[PDB]
């Protein structure tokens, strides 16, 4: 009977495509991050601790 | 004793250019510049004086 009144409908919302769960960036350390507001390099020093004498 | 931990710093001014102080702009006649906002061309003009017979 209706041939040109039952409309075909589009959701107004698109699929997100899916690619992968990203992990790494919440599981390394991010401190360097203040500092390195400017600057091309970040330089980052280590403690050679003092040695125990008897 | 200190490889790593002693910063280099860079200052946050630029050395601004010494450059000439320009002066002509203000030595020369600006009068047409009421003128001139318009066209591509000004037209000055100068009398021929009448010249005296015996």
């Not at 091309?40 to 020093?45: L, P, Q, T």
Request: hydrophobic letters at 50%; zero cysteines; proline letters at 4%.
């Amino acid at each position: 009977a209706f041939n040109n009144f039952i409309p075909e409908l589009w959701s107004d919302m698109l699929l997100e495509e899916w690619t992968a769960q990203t992990v790494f960036a919440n599981l390394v350390n991010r401190e360097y991050e203040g500092i390195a507001s400017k600057g091309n390099v970040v330089h980052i020093a280590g403690v050679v601790a003092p040695t125990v004498k008897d």
